[PDB]
Amino acid sequence: REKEQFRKLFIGGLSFETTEESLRNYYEQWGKLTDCVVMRDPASKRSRGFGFVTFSSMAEVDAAMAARPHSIDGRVVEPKRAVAREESGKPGAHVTVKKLFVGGIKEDTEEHHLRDYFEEYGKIDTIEIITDRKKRGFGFVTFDDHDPVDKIVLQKYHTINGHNAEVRKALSRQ
RNA sequence: AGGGACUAG
């Protein structure tokens, strides 16, 4: 079975009334859950206003996300790909951004190479190879929704054109 | 932005 991190959504903006049961119920209309949880405060056991749900496959998750917005107990919720514990610390972890930095591509990799690979994740605005003078070995890609990026950065390394290529949410300066 | 879970630290 696929890694959990690739099958899991963070669900923010929940009602303090929302239970696992109704969370579990609403997200089952796109597949089988293997885990469900409204995070609660240790002492009080009051909701923290977000939870997690885990589907059996990535295909299920995508459909869930194709079917936005979501609404549970009168609140529009904020489903997001679950960012790993490992990661949840640095800037640009929960930055919900639409641009993506792409590195480790070397001089033999072209603007079309990047479309080929990334068009699959969602629709694109723009691509940018970087050079001065031949080619610095990195570039940028810009999607219409944040979710392509979010899906992309669940995996640090993407194999593109014979290279172990590294992806990162694009930060300003900085 | 992590409660449980866990065959790559």
Numbering used by the authors: 15 to 147, 151 to 191
What does the paper say about this structure?
In order to understand the molecular basis for hnRNP A2/B1 recognizing different RNA sequences, we grew the crystals of hnRNP A2/B1 (aa 12–195) in complex with different 10mer RNA mutants. Three complex structures containing RNA mutants A1G, U6G, and A7U were determined at high resolution. For the A1G mutant (5′-A0G1G2G3A4C5U6A7G8C9-3′), the AGG motif is shifted to 5′-end and recognized by RRM1 in a manner almost identical to the wild-type 10mer RNA structure. In addition, the G3 is recognized by the side chains of Arg99 and Glu18 of RRM1 through hydrogen bond formation. Therefore, RRM1 of hnRNP A2/B1 can specifically recognize an AGGG motif as demonstrated in the A1G mutant structure. Additionally, RRM2 recognizes UAG in the same manner as was seen in the structure of wild-type 10mer RNA. Moreover, two hnRNP A2/B1 proteins bound to same RNA strands can adopt various orientations, as seen in the structures of the 10mer RNA and the two 10mer RNA mutants A1G and U6G. These diverse orientations are mainly due to the absence of direct interactions between the RRM domains bound to the same RNA strands.
